[PDB]
From a paper:
Siroheme is the modified isobacteriochlorin tetrapyrrole used by siroheme-dependent sulfite and nitrite reductases (SiR/NiRs) in catalyzing the six-electron reduction of sulfite to sulfide or nitrite to ammonia. CysG is encoded by a gene fusion between a C-terminal SUMT (CysGA) and an N-terminal bifunctional dehydrogenase/ferrochelatase (CysGB). The N-terminal enzyme module, CysGB, is a three-domain bifunctional dehydrogenase/ATP-independent class III ferrochelatase12 that performs the final two steps of siroheme biosynthesis. The C-terminal enzyme module, CysGA, is homologous to a well-studied class of SAM-dependent uro’gen III methyltransferases (SUMTs) that catalyzes the methylations to generate precorrin-210,13.
P1331Cβ sits 3.3 Å below the plane formed by the sirohydrochlorin isobacteriochlorin core, forming a hydrophobic platform for the macrocycle. Both P133G and P133H variants retained the ability to complement the cysG-deficient E. coli when challenged for growth on minimal media, albeit with accumulation of fluorescence indicating altered activity. The P133G variant has 5-fold lower dehydrogenase activity and is about 10-fold lower in its chelatase activity, whereas the P133H variant is deficient for dehydrogenase activity and about 10-fold lower in its chelatase activity. Structurally, the histidine side chain projects in the active site, where it would interfere with tetrapyrrole binding, but no gross structural defects were present in the P133H variant as evidenced by a low RMSD to Met8p. The bulkier histidine projects into the active site, positioned in place of the pyrrole nitrogens when the tetrapyrrole binds, so would also disrupt tetrapyrrole binding and release. P133H behaves similarly to R260A, somewhat less sensitive.
Author numbering:
A (entry chain B): 1 to 269, 277 to 358, 364 to 457
B (entry chain A): 1 to 270, 277 to 457
Write the structure that this text describes.
Amino acid sequence: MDHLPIFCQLRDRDCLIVGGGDVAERKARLLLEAGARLTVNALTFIPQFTVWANEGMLTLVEGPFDETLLDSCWLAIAATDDDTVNQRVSDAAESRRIFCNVVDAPKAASFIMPSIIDRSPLMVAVSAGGTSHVLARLLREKLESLLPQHLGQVARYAGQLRARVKKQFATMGERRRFWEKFFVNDRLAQSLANADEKAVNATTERLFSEPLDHRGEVVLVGAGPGDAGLLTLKGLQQIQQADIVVYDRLVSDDIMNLVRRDADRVFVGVPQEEINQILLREAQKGKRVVRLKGGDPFIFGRGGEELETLCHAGIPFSVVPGITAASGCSAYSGIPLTHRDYAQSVRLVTGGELDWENLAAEKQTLVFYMGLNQAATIQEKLIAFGMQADMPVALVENGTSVKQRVVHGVLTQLGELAQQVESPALIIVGRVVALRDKLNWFSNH
Amino acid sequence: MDHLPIFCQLRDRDCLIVGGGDVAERKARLLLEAGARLTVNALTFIPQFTVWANEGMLTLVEGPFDETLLDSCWLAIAATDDDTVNQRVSDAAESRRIFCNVVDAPKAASFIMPSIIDRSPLMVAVSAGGTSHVLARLLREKLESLLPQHLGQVARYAGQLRARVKKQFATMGERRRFWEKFFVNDRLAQSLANADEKAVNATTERLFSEPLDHRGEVVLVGAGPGDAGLLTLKGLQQIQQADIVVYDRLVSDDIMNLVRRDADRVFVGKVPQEEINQILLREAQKGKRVVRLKGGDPFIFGRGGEELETLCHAGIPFSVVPGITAASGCSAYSGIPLTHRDYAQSVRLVTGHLKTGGELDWENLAAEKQTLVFYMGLNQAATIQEKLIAFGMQADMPVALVENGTSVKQRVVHGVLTQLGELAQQVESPALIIVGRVVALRDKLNWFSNH
Ligand SMILES: Nc1ncnc2c1ncn2[C@@H]1O[C@H](CSCC[C@H](N)C(=O)O)[C@@H](O)[C@H]1O
Ligand SMILES: Nc1ncnc2c1ncn2[C@@H]1O[C@H](CSCC[C@H](N)C(=O)O)[C@@H](O)[C@H]1O
């Protein structure tokens, strides 16, 4: 222990920042978020300070550092580019026993500012003694990804409720198991954040009526197309809380590596009815169920079918969208789905029968899902229905993954090019495909 | 934020604890480890306070509270079981502008003491503000299984190298590139943990020897439609490490709160497009890691292509992190799947604002078995209704408008196609128009809110 972390209550307390440039602006922003009664003293100010001053948010004192400005101070920050001024600030603060930070000199004064993860009233702070700002930031990034955005809502609502939980639960063992379920109920958190009382109270005494061991729900989570970094923050959080993860072939190994160590896994890679009942069966055993699907759940994912099974049974559900194959393949192949006036619309199409005259019309970007089989037919029909034979085409196999393959050419070679790839692959047809020679940044295989 | 966390240097600074029971003993142990010059003022003391004052580790003042004991103090802790005494302490500390903790009353006084995870010199502090003692410990447990124990040795070694890093790398940019390699070298971490000095030195000399890439970079990052939970892990990594973030009005405040606190930020909401291109170009040429943070997905009606197409000729590295486009986010959060069973053979993402005297291909857009999603089409909703009808879309085709989709302020209105124009007057931008049979599924699949 070389530093003692404390969480200061600054609301309406006088604090002083010396300095008026970009560094001081960042510290002022932070102290204002904490409700400090802030004075800023500097020889000159960048315009953000005059804005705040004109909105009554702080006081400005233009001129040399005046150590009487510390007279009723609780905290001081020296944020100038002048070592001599910063040392004058820290000496004047030290003689008054005012905790003081010198931004460019962590061992020069009496406190250092840690990296902060804010879920107020819940807060986390990280500091390596000031000798590793990159390390503290790498930890902040991990923590920001793991703490749900609305955790603070549930933290505050916990107090509004501590009495009722003591009278329905006698032992401290059951009370702890109640808090465990309460704080990971992200649905209650989101309902609190939405200010939706009908949803809030519907979730609340469902927590008091259900037995403590029951936590039955289904979350559909979009895994994205392959790259584990394309999972959403909320997707990661949900798969870290699942009792049971139901997945298939199109969820990548990298994503599955993120699944919490002791979750049960069920591989359904199998008619849809079997899958719908698996989710129902697992949810009615009272378990927190995540159905992980490749890409986005509601784009040729049959996610709607999985959810109507559950609405029937009174099982709570939610959906976390994911990066669909079109978006992932577009970004990683350097083929934007729109560009300038090239396309008035993007068409996401599955390979009843397709309306070929419609697909052939000009000023579209066509994106075929599950169309490898019909790729010879697609070429033949588009040409017969008037698409210019020189229309650029591309096929992206295993888009966003470390084995992504991109082959490209013109419409007359589509059935040719399709044999060079296997599923999962996308076919993109449109003038945007010509941009790849300028926008290609990801390694090809 | 409720509180500002700070990490205080207490070495040789006077602190006062009032009270002498088990609570006071726990706080005194903490202050003593931090190097505080400690006085403890109490009517009675439990035995542990006798062992400490025998070894000269603190000063005991046996008796009622003496507020003059605060006169030279930097921190005060009120740890009696007498609320009247605790409040006299906190009043006396407040008059002296001394940060003061009242252990049994976290909402009183002026600082709270967090739970600590110790990987010294690395430290992680957690508190819920006293609103919930339980949540802190549940979080504390998770964070300990997350932070390897040898993280302290990595941090310790970094502190030792800091002078040499500062001497050999003249700019903050070069130093940052070194540290980013240092802190993810798993072999160095293992050698430190094993006290293998030859292996430490071999990897260290190689790290110092590596030529650094002084080129900047432009990364286009899809922020998603608003809910900060819908940023990708890679997009969070990019904004947590950017030098400068160029962003616009359709990037939500919650996502902006995830940006590196130290990054410069340039707002280009209403800046013309060719000037955005120049900002990214010149900032990357200056060697900075630039993030262009865009609403939704960068390559769907986001002009991301225009922002990139100068860069390869300029020899400036770039990449793209895709994001959740408005269609996908609004779909999920409104209960309206974009595809379902035989309802749609395709999803059409259409712009409702055209350049020139441009006309959409209404005959093509009116076809059956599709879900139409119009972006920036609010001003055109009356025209969209009339044209779709005139080219034969059924008059009772369901429609929906999602305003601020995925945000806590999201609003959804719905009806049939002959109501589209009037429905659009009920929302404001940003809003998506969804046209198609899948809109009827909302009453079954809507989970997010009814506002
Ligand atoms: N990584 C990937 N690269 C290219 N195409 C992919 C892909 N992952 C899925 N696909 C496409 O998606 C089809 C499965 S249908 C499932 C689509 C998914 N819900 C999504 O939103 O993307 C595959 O046949 C293939 O055409
Ligand atoms: N949160 C949101 N809710 C509803 N519509 C949104 C939205 N965010 C963006 N939009 C739509 O997107 C249009 C801007 S065009 C930029 C779209 C972005 N690249 C994307 O992929 O989503 C807006 O006019 C509005 O129609």
